[PDB]
A paper describes a structure:
We present the structural and functional characterisation of a subtilase autotransporter, Ssp, from the opportunistic pathogen Serratia marcescens. Autotransporters (ATs) are the largest family of secreted proteins in Gram-negative bacteria with many having important roles in bacterial infection and disease, including adhering to and invading host cells, biofilm formation along with being potent cytotoxins and immunomodulators. Subtilase ATs comprise one of the two AT families which possess protease activity, with the other being the (chymo)trypsin-like protease ATs which include SPATEs (serine protease autotransporters of Enterobactericeae). We further reveal that the activity of the subtilase AT is required for entry into epithelial cells as well as causing cellular toxicity.
A number of SeMet datasets were merged, which were used along with the Ssp model to solve the structure using single isomorphous replacement with anomalous scattering (SIRAS) and molecular replacement with single wavelength anomalous diffraction (MRSAD). One molecule of Ssp is present in the asymmetric unit, where the resulting structure was refined against a higher resolution native (2.0 Å) dataset with a final and Rfactor/Rfree of 16.3/20.1 (crystallographic statistics in Table 1). The subtilase domain of Ssp is positioned directly on top of the β-helical domain, essentially capping the β-helical scaffold. The core architecture of the protease domain of Ssp is typical of the subtilisin-like folds observed in other subtilase enzymes. It is comprised of a globular α/β fold centrally featuring a twisted seven-stranded parallel β-sheet adjacent to two central α-helices and encompassing the active site residues D76, H112 and S341. A disulfide bond (Cys288 to Cys295) connects the last β-strand of the β-sheet to its preceding loop. In comparison to the subtilisin BPN’, the catalytic triad sits at the bottom of a deep cleft formed by two protruding β-hairpins (E1 and E3) on one side and an extended loop (E2) on the other which are absent from subtilisin BPN’. Ssp harbours a deletion, equivalent to residues 98–109 of subtilisin BPN’, adjacent to the subtilisin BPN’ S4 subsite. This results in a truncated α-helix and makes the binding cleft wider, which conceivably allows for a more extensive substrate binding interface. Interestingly, the Ssp β-helix is the shortest seen to date for an AT, comprising of seven right-handed triangular turns (~40 Å in length), with the last three β-strand rungs resembling an autochaperone domain, which previous studies have shown are involved in AT passenger folding. The structural characterisation of Ssp revealed the presence of three calcium binding sites, two in the subtilase domain and one in the β-helical stalk domain.
Numbering used by the authors: 29 to 642
The structure:
C-alpha cells in the first residue's frame, strides 16, 4: 500500500478507506494525521469480547486471556461469535493499509483482555502493569426494562426498550456505600479470576491510565450507572475517567444514547451511530446449522470481515483513539492532562457550556492538537454538575522534559521523551479558566494564544516563551526563563530566574509591574544603531539583578572585540509609564577599556557600551 497521506495536506488523508468510517471526518482526525500524529508508539488496552485475529490488527495485537474466543449460545445451542471487542478495537486502531476502514489511532498497538469467560487468566493486573496508556470499557450494567402487567417488554415508539431511568441521588449513594471496599480492593494486585470491576478500574486510574467508558444505550432521559459515577467516591481520579455519549451526527445524540447526566464534568460526545468497523462471523461451511455440534465436527469457520454497529460502545473507542493520537502529540503529558485537552477542546453542543446531554461536547482532534483551552478548577464547573472534591488542583503542571529524559518515572507508563515536542512545544489555543500554569522540565513551551486563565504562572525550569498574551502574574524561579515578544500581566524574577525578551531581539510587554530580585538575570541582546531587547512595563521594581549583554542569538556575553565594535551605542532596555524604583546590582560584561553602563532616566533604563571613565 502506497499511502497518499502527506504532512501539511489534511485532504490527502480523506481516502476511500478513511471515508468508509464517517466518525473520522466528524472528529477531524485528518488534521492530526497532516501534523504527523497517528498514535505511533502508543499502546491501547481493551476490556471486551476477545478481539479476532483480523488482517486489520496483524502485527499490532496482543491478547492476555485463557486462549478461547467469546461465543454466545441459545436454548438450542445455536452458536454466535461475540464480535463486539473486534468492532471496538477496529474503531480505535484498525490498520490504515488501503483495505476496509482504519482506526482513529491507526499506528497504535492493542492489548486485549476478555470482559467475560476469562477462566483464571483475566489479564487485568497484567493490563494495569503494561504500557497500555488508555483502557476502553465499552460495557456496563443495563437498568430494568419497564414491563406490562403480563411481563412483556414495553417498547417506545422510537423502536427502543422503555428502560427505567437511574436516579442521580441513588446511583451516587450506591457508589458512596461501595467506597471503603472499592478503596481496599484497589490497593492489592487484581486476582486472575473472580475480581471487582470497580477496584480494577480505580487501580488502573491510579497507575496512570486513562479510563474510557461508554455512557450506555438506555435513552436520553437516562443517566450513567454507579460504576461510571466512581469519581464521586474517588474525585482524585475524575481527570482519569471519560464517559462517552453516542452522536448520530456532528450535533445530535442518538435516540438510544444515555445522557452524560451526573458525569457531565467528565463526559464527552463522539460518533456512535452506524459505525463501520472490523467484525467476525461464525458461519457453516456446509450450509447447515451454526451450533456447538457443528462447531465440534469442524463444519464451522470463524471469518473476519466488516459490519455496521450503533451504540455508546462504538463512541467510546473514538475517544480512546483520540487519546492515543494526543499521547503522540503531547508525549510529556500525563493521562489526566490528556483528559483536560480532550475535554476543553471539545466543540460545545446543545445548551452553552457543560450540559447533562453532551457534557463538554464533541471531541475535536483539529482543536485538541493546538493545546488545552482551559486550566479547569471547581469555579469553571456549573454547580449542577460539580463533583465534590474534584478539580481542586490550581496549577496545570506542564513538564517539557527535554529530548532523552524520562517522564512518569516509577509508573507502568514510564517512558523516555524522544520526539521534538519534548524539547520545544507551542500551544496556539486560547487558554481560559480559573487555573494557572506551572512550567517545569529543561525544555521550552511557547504560548501563542490570547490567554485569559486567572491563575498565576510559575516558571520553575527551562523557558516559557509568551508570543500571544497571558493576563496572569508570572513568577520566574531558579533555572527558569520568561521569553517572547508577547504580553504578560506582571512578572517577578527571583534569584537565578531569567527574563530574555523577544525570539532574539524583541520587546516583552508587561501590563503591570516588572520586578527583578537580587540574583535575577536580564539577558539583553543588542545590535547596531540602538536596536536591543526591551521590557515595556507599566512600572518597575529593581531590587537587584544582573543585566547580561550579548549579540542576537549568541550563546556568550559580548567578547572584547564585539564590545569595542559597539562602543558608543545607546539602547533602551526598560520603559515604564509610572516609574522605575531601585537599580540593577550590575551589568555584564566589563573589560579594562570598554564596559556596559546602565543609565537610569527616571521612567526608562538605558544601556551604553562606553569607555571606562576614559
Ligand atoms: Ca484498514
Ligand atoms: Ca453544551
Ligand atoms: Ca532577546
Amino acid at each position: 500500500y502506497q499511502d497518499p497521506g502527506r504532512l501539511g495536506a489534511p485532504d490527502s488523508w480523506k481516502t476511500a478507506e478513511f471515508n468508509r468510517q464517517w466518525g473520522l471526518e466528524a472528529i477531524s482526525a485528518e488534521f492530526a494525521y497532516a501534523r504527523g500524529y497517528t498514535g505511533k508508539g502508543i499502546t491501547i488496552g481493551v476490556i471486551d469480547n476477545a478481539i479476532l485475529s483480523h488482517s486489520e490488527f496483524s502485527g499490532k495485537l496482543t491478547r492476555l486471556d485463557n486462549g478461547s474466543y467469546n461465543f454466545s449460545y441459545d436454548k438450542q445451542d445455536n452458536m454466535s461469535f461475540g464480535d463486539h471487542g473486534t468492532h471496538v478495537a477496529g474503531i480505535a486502531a484498525a490498520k490504515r493499509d488501503g483495505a476496509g476502514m482504519h482506526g482513529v489511532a491507526f499506528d497504535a498497538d492493542i492489548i486485549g483482555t476478555k470482559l467475560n469467560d476469562y477462566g483464571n487468566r483475566n489479564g487485568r493486573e497484567e493490563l494495569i502493569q503494561s504500557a497500555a496508556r488508555v483502557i476502553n470499557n465499552s460495557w456496563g450494567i443495563a437498568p430494568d426494562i419497564r414491563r406490562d402487567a403480563k411481563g412483556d417488554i414495553i417498547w417506545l415508539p422510537n423502536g427502543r426498550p422503555d428502560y427505567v431511568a437511574f436516579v442521580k441521588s441513588e446511583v451516587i449513594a450506591e457508589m458512596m456505600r461501595s467506597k471503603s471496599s472499592v478503596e481496599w480492593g484497589s490497593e492489592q494486585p487484581v486476582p486472575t479470576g473472580g475480581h471487582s470491576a470497580m477496584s480494577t478500574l480505580l487501580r488502573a486510574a491510579r497507575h496512570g491510565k486513562l479510563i474510557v467508558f461508554s455512557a450506555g444505550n438506555y435513552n436520553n432521559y437516562n443517566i450513567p450507572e454507579a460504576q461510571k459515577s466512581l469519581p464521586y467516591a474517588f474525585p482524585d481520579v475524575l481527570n482519569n475517567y471519560l464517559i462517552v455519549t453516542n452522536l448520530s451526527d456532528e450535533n445530535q445524540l442518538s435516540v438510544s444514547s444515555t445522557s452524560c447526566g451526573q458525569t457531565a464534568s467528565y463526559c464527552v460526545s463522539a460518533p456512535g451511530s452506524d459505525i463501520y468497523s472490523t467484525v467476525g462471523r461464525l458461519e457453516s461451511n456446509t450450509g447447515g446449522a451454526v451450533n456447538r455440534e457443528a462447531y465440534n465436527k469442524g463444519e464451522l469457520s470463524l471469518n473476519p470481515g466488516y459490519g455496521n454497529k450503533s451504540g455508546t460502545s462504538m463512541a467510546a473507542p473514538h475517544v480512546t483513539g483520540v487519546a492515543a493520537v494526543l499521547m503522540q502529540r503531547f508525549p510529556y503529558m500525563s493521562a489526566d492532562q490528556i483528559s483536560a485537552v480532550i475535554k476543553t477542546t471539545a466543540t460545545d453542543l446543545g445548551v452553552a457550556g457543560i450540559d447533562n446531554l453532551f457534557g463538554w461536547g464533541r471531541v475535536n482532534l483539529r482543536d485538541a492538537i493546538n493545546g488545552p483551552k482551559m486550566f479547569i478548577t471547581k469555579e469553571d464547573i456549573p454547580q449542577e454538575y460539580y463533583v465534590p472534591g474534584s478539580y481542586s488542583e490550581k496549577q496545570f503542571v506542564v513538564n517539557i522534559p527535554g529530548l532523552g529524559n524520562i517522564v512518569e518515572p516509577g509508573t507502568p507508563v514510564e517512558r523516555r521523551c524522544t520526539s521534538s515536542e519534548c524539547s520545544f512545544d507551542s500551544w496556539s489555543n486560547d487558554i481560559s479558566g480559573h487555573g494557572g500554569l506551572t512550567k517545569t522540565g529543561a525544555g521550552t513551551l511557547a504560548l501563542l494564544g490570547n490567554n485569559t486563565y486567572r491563575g498565576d504562572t510559575w516558571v520553575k525550569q527551562g523557558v516559557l516563551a509568551i508570543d500571544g498574551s497571558v493576563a496572569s502574574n508570572v513568577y520566574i524561579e531558579n533555572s527558569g526563563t520568561l521569553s517572547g515578544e508577547g504580553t504578560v500581566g506582571a512578572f517577578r524574577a527571583a534569584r537565578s530566574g531569567s527574563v530574555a525578551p523577544g525570539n532574539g531581539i524583541g520587546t516583552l510587554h508587561v501590563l503591570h509591574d516588572a520586578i527583578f530580585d537580587r540574583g535575577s538575570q536580564y539577558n539583553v541582546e543588542v545590535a547596531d544603531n540602538g536596536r536591543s531587547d526591551k521590557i515595556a512595563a507599566r512600572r518597575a521594581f529593581l531590587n537587584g539583578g544582573s543585566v547580561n549583554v550579548s549579540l542576537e542569538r549568541s550563546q556568550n556575553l559580548l567578547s572584547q572585540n564585539e564590545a569595542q565594535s559597539l562602543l558608543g551605542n545607546k539602547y533602551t532596555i526598560l520603559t515604564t509609564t509610572d516609574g522605575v524604583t531601585g537599580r540593577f546590582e550590575n551589568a555584564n560584561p566589563s573589560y579594562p577599556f570598554v564596559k556596559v553602563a546602565l543609565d537610569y532616566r527616571g521612567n526608562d533604563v538605558g544601556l551604553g557600551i562606553t569607555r571606562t571613565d576614559a
